[PDB]
Nucleic acid binder design. Structure first.
Ligand code: TMP
Lengths: 92, 95, 92, 97
DNA sequence: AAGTTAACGCTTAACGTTAAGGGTTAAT
DNA sequence: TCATTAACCCTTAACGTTAAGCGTTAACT
């Protein structure tokens, strides 16, 4: 009943489930602390690079993270520009 | 199939722009988008933005998410090709 | 509502003089995301940015600091004012 | 700003001289009253830490003072110290409109 | 004329760096 | 004991760098 930012999933399903702080996760992923923390704060998306890193580290699949992101981005784009795009583009 | 990932622009060409014989420039006028935007996607020099997946989904009567999935699988694959081996070397997997 | 300082910069200065975010950036000698993130209301005015904006627009720098300080006070009060009032009793 | 005009006044100076000494309150005791850790008050009193917006609210409620008073001291201090470090260089690279 | 595209600028995501505010712990 | 403060880490703001998506104006077919 809402589009879920991937950082929500990382925060509630992995970080808080495994009791891992953002800074600790960043050290294990070999990235800077803002890279993990901006995602967890729902202020950054999952890059292709971070999906590999997250899937490698948490055993999960990398596509899983990519799909979380692309669904979030599609829903975010739609709510923003959907009715306008539909008003200006006639199909076939 | 040569085990290379498929860029979405090749689908936009060989399965939509040639099937319906539509001009890159004509598609752009139809999508109310600039000409270089369509042309760069066709030319495999740009990815499918979320705005563009909505537009192609709407025009060509396909899912918008179909295009998003084509893009994600591609850029995941190309990121893996360019960095997966290094990423696997430096990250140990909590187990 | 608390007005973000970027709003006052976007609407009372950039729009009054038809200056793009990118152009202001070249004139202030900062990177383009530094001006653009202020304009988008995703970044506060730093003291260094208040000096640059004060110098460019012949305002005081304190003017920009006061916009920032009133904004971040309101923000912080909206985030924690009720809890802080609950947990602190005033001196008598 | 100082009377001699040669340095900015840090808000912790006002905190300890005009409130802590005026009321005989220890930094550690102020920390207990404000519900913050002891180094938070003590680093402000030692003029080693700025007043955050959260801390201005705590100080405002506790001392009946206004919270913006504390913000105003901090921003003037942060402006003055930013300007002494970089004002000339900013002045040379930015032509006004 | 109309489709392509190489140039150029604007906006803005992702990233590492640096630094500051904060709590904790423990030393003084 | 009780207050001060050092040392350390975590979270997060501001910043430059880089690169991607996009539109515009021109060259080119
Ligand atoms: C309309 C037009 C088409 N073309 C066509 C001819 C070919 O079909 C295509 C590329 O040719 P190019 O190589 O000379 O472009 C021009 O070269 N010039 C024009 O003005």
């Amino acid at each position: 009943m809402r589009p879920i930012h991937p950082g929500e999933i990382l925060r509630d399903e992995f970080l808080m489930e495994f009791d891992i702080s953002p800074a600790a996760l960043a050290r294990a992923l070999k990235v800077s602390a803002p890279t993990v923390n901006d995602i967890v704060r729902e202020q950054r998306g999952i890059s292709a690079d971070m999906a590999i890193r997250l899937g490698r580290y948490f055993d999960t699949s990398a596509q899983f993270w990519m799909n979380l992101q692309s669904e979030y981005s599609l829903a975010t784009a739609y709510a923003a520009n959907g009715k306008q795009i539909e008003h200006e583009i006639e199909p076939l």
